[PDB]
C-alpha cells in the first residue's frame, strides 16, 4: 500500500480528543428535535440571570429561609455597616452559592463587571435613605459611612424606588481575575449603610427586610475548565 509511518501518539487514548468513530447503529431513524423553550448555548449565560444572595449565613440563619433576609433592625446611628460583602465571588462563603458563583466553581479565571440589585420589602408607607457602596481591590473594609461615601456608591431612596442596581465595575490588575481560593484576592466591597435612619408611618411592624440579587454581565468570561465532585 501507500508508504506509511506510525509516529508518537499512536495507540494512545486522549480523553480530550476529537476523532471520528464507527457508528454502532447504521441508518437509525433518529427522532428529530422540537423547539422546546429555553435552549442554552453557553454556561456564562446562566450567570447573567439575577440570583438571590444569602447575606446572613449566621449559625442559626445559614441553610434556612432567613439566610436570604437582611433585617433592618433598630440600632445606633453607629456607622457600623448594615451588611458588608467581599467581592471575592469564590473566596467568600456567601457569594459562592449563587448561580453566578456556581459557574465560578468550574474555572480558574473570570473577568468583567457584576451587578448587585436589592429589592426593598418594607411597608410602602415608610421612608428613609440608604447608601450602597463599593471599594476597589485592596482597601480596608470601609467601616464608617464617611469612608464608604468616598468610593463608588449610589444613594438608594427607599421611599421612591423599591429596587436598586449598583454595577461593580471591572477594576482589576490582570486581564483574567483569579477565581481560585487565594489569600486575600481583591475584590470589591458591596455594602449598604444607614444614610439616615428609617422613617416609619403610623404603626408598621418597624422591621422589614431587603433581598439581594447578583448576576454577571455580557463582558463576563471564564477559562481553564477545572472541577471537583465527591
Amino acid at each position, epitope marked *: 500500500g501507500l508508504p506509511v509511518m506510525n509516529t508518537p501518539g499512536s495507540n494512545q487514548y486522549l480523553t480530550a480528543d476529537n476523532f471520528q468513530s464507527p457508528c454502532a447503529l447504521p441508518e437509525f431513524d433518529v427522532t428529530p428535535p422540537i423547539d422546546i423553550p429555553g435552549e442554552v448555548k453557553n454556561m456564562m449565560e446562566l450567570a447573567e440571570i439575577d440570583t438571590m444572595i444569602p*447575606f*446572613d*449565613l*449566621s*449559625a*442559626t*440563619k*445559614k441553610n434556612t429561609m432567613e439566610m436570604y433576609r437582611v*433585617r433592618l*433592625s433598630d440600632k*445606633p446611628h453607629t456607622d*457600623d*455597616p*448594615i*451588611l*458588608c460583602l*467581599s467581592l471575592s465571588p469564590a473566596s*467568600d*462563603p*456567601r457569594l459562592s452559592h449563587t448561580m453566578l458563583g456556581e459557574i465560578l466553581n468550574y474555572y480558574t479565571h473570570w473577568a468583567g463587571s457584576l451587578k448587585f440589585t436589592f429589592l426593598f420589602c418594607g411597608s410602602m408607607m415608610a421612608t428613609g435613605k440608604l447608601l450602597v457602596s463599593y471599594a476597589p481591590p485592596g482597601a*480596608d*473594609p470601609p*467601616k464608617k459611612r464617611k469612608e464608604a461615601m468616598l468610593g463608588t456608591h449610589v444613594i438608594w431612596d427607599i421611599g421612591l424606588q423599591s429596587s436598586c442596581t449598583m454595577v461593580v465595575p471591572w477594576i482589576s490588575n490582570t486581564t483574567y481575575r483569579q477565581t481560585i*481560593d487565594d*489569600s*486575600f484576592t481583591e475584590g470589591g*466591597y458591596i*455594602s449598604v449603610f444607614y444614610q439616615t435612619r428609617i422613617v416609619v408611618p403610623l404603626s408598621t411592624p418597624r422591621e422589614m427586610d431587603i433581598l439581594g440579587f447578583v448576576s454577571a454581565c455580557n463582558d463576563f468570561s471564564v477559562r481553564l475548565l477545572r472541577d471537583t465532585t465527591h
Partner: nanobody
Amino acid sequence: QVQLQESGGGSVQPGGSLTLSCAASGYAVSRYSMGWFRQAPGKENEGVAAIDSSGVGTTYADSVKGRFTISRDNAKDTVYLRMNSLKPEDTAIYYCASGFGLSLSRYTYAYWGQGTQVTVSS
C-alpha cells in the same frame, strides 16, 4: 473552608467572668477579624464584642460596655473574649464569627461556630 472552634464556654456565676477563644483554620485569623454574638434563647442574635486583627480598635455593645473586654493574638491564631461582671440575662447561646471587621451587625461575618452556652446564674 475555615472552621474556628468556640472554646472557654462554661456555666459560671452572677458578677463573675469567663474567657472565651476561637482558633483559626483555612486562613490566619489576622486577615479577617473576629467577634461574638450571644443569641439569647428565643430572641435574635445579640452583638457583644468585636476587634480587628491587623488594626486593633475594639467595639462593644452598650448593654455590656465597660464591663466586657475582647483581645487578640494573631500569632497564636486565637481570639480572646473577656466577659466580665456576668449577670442572669448574660445567659445566652454564645457564638464567635469572622467578618469585616470588627462591626457587631447581626452578620458581616462569614464562618461562625457551634454555639457555646454560658449559664451565668447557674
